[PDB]
């Protein structure tokens, strides 16, 4: 069973600009583990599989969170550390193109449909329960948990937003964009790590290891 109430509870329980951004990401990696432990049945998976799912999904999970946090920011994002990054500052740091993709494909679309925190939490739990993650000991159990999440999300959307029958599908169809932006984010991060000119803290650095 997968009650949307517990998923919202997990969201609520955890509530060089590139250097600022990396610091915020490292801070939120610790909070991400706490969030994941509060998603129903995650902690019951084998420890190896919990590791695989969080290593595979952390960037999409954090991008979804800070994008939704930024709905009331004009042309920018709100970092977990309290700072804004405006698109002009992002451009000035050499990461303008991917930053604009976050604003246009995620933040503005979350703002336009007024995605709420239960929906964000369900989308993140779907991302977390990624049965394609390589090396999982039981992919079928992860797919089953994913199916429980989106069954609960759909019932929630249909009840709270009955005038928007397409809202459930509209939520899920942000996940390809999230995947693409996440992959590009990872490529930038591996390049920052290679160049050596950008401080990367211990947990973010660990996520960038083999």
């Amino acid at each position: 069973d997968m009650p949307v109430e517990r998923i919202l509870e997990a969201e609520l329980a955890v509530e060089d600009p590139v250097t600022n951004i990396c610091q915020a990401a490292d801070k939120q990696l610790f909070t991400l583990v706490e969030w994941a432990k509060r998603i129903p049945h995650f902690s019951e998976l084998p420890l190896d599989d919990q590791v695989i799912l969080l290593r595979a999904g952390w960037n999409e999970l954090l991008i979804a969170s800070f994008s939704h946090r930024s709905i009331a920011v004009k042309d920018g994002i709100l970092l977990a550390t309290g700072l804004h990054v405006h698109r002009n500052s992002a451009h000035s740091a050499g990461v303008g193109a991917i930053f604009d993709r976050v604003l246009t494909e995620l933040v503005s679309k979350m703002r336009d449909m007024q995605m709420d925190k239960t929906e964000l939490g369900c989308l993140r739990a779907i991302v977390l329960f990624n049965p394609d993650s390589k090396g999982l000991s039981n992919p079928a159990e992860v797919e089953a948990l994913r199916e429980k999440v989106y069954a609960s999300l759909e019932a929630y959307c249909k009840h709270k937003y009955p005038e928007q029958p397409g809202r459930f599908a509209k939520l899920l169809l942000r996940l390809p964009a999230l995947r693409s932006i996440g992959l590009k984010c990872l490529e930038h991060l591996f390049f920052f790590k290679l160049i050596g000119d950008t401080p990367i803290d211990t947990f973010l650095m660990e996520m960038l290891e083999a």
């Binding site: 610790f30 583990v33 432990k37 590791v51 290593r55 660990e206």
Partner: peptide, 9 residues
């Protein structure tokens, strides 16, 4: 995966 394991325990 050292930090991640420790935090999951």
């Amino acid at each position: 995966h050292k930090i991640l394991h420790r935090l999951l325990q």
